[PDB]
Each structure stands twice: as structure tokens, then as C-alpha cells.
Design a protein around this ligand. Structure first.
Ligand SMILES: [Cl-]
Ligand SMILES: [Cl-]
Length: 162
């Protein structure tokens, strides 16, 4: 198990524009296209992202290309972030995957915001951090995915995904 396979399980793969849980236009592996209510604004963005006139549909390769870009941007965002970097440095490899997952889903700014949990993560107070992370909209909105991430964080194993 690795971060790619972990995210692919969590986000799925869709070759046609779709709406996410929040209602936003998305494509491939959890790639947010736009927060705009317009399918046309989403088709525009998608065409810009792919470099071709897609008509709202892409290939698996295209989707994988986007995914590769997003994991990288996720990683670089963490390392560039003053609040995130130190948490990530302090973690083992499994737990790092978990933070990358959060970041990929909710943005760097989003995660950087979880001040109290970041502090518990750094002090390696696993159980407590798990309890605090569940007290969020994230968990309430996408509970099954959130539980998997929180379990990876608490345990440091890949059980939840096995
Ligand atoms: Cl892009
Ligand atoms: Cl869910």
C-alpha cells in the first residue's frame, strides 16, 4: 500500500465530469475542477487542464496524469507550509501518507487550520488526535473516508485499507 493506491481507493476514478459530495465539478481521481455552478465553467477548466477540447470526457491516462500532478502538488504544499512541514517531518511513513491524503482532499490551507490536532500529531498523542480530528465537518460530511484516514493516523498501519 502506498499514497497513490490509498487515494485511488478513497476518491475512485471517473472519466466524465461529475459532482463531488459538496456539489463541485470534478473529474478523474478526485481532481476538483471548479466551485462554479456552471457545467460550462467546468468544461472550460477541464479543457485548460488537459490541453485539449474534451467535451467533459478524458481518458484513463489523462486522469492519471492529473492525479500524478495533484499528489506532487499535495506533497510540495506540505513541505512549503510553515505549519505543516514540521508535522510531516516528525511522522513515520504511514502517518505521512495520511496527512498527504487530508491535504489532497481539503487543501493545505484547510489542514493547516486544524491547529489542535497538528499539535497532538507532533506530540504523537495518537488517540487524542484521532478524537479531535473526528470533531470536524470533514468527518461529518464524508465519515467512511474520514474514519479510514483517522485510523491510519491513530494506528500507523494500513489496516483500514486492507
Ligand atoms: Cl491543472
Ligand atoms: Cl465517506
Amino acid at each position: 500500500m502506498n499514497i497513490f493506491e490509498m487515494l485511488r481507493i478513497d476518491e475512485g476514478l471517473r472519466l466524465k465530469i461529475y459532482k463531488d459530495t459538496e456539489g463541485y465539478y470534478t473529474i478523474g481521481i478526485g481532481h476538483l475542477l471548479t466551485k462554479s455552478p456552471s457545467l460550462n465553467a467546468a468544461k472550460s477548466e477541464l479543457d485548460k487542464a488537459i490541453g485539449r477540447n474534451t467535451n467533459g470526457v478524458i481518458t484513463k491516462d489523462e486522469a492519471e496524469k492529473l492525479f500524478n500532478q495533484d499528489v506532487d502538488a499535495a506533497v510540495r504544499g506540505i513541505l512549503r507550509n510553515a505549519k505543516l512541514k514540521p508535522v510531516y517531518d516528525s511522522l513515520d511513513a504511514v502517518r505521512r501518507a495520511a496527512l498527504i491524503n487530508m491535504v489532497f482532499q481539503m487543501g493545505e490551507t484547510g489542514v493547516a487550520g486544524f491547529t489542535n490536532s497538528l499539535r497532538m500529531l507532533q506530540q504523537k498523542r495518537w488517540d487524542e488526535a484521532a478524537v479531535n480530528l473526528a470533531k470536524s465537518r470533514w468527518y461529518n460530511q464524508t465519515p467512511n473516508r474520514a474514519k479510514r484516514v483517522i485510523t491510519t493516523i491513530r494506528t500507523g498501519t494500513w489496516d483500514a485499507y486492507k
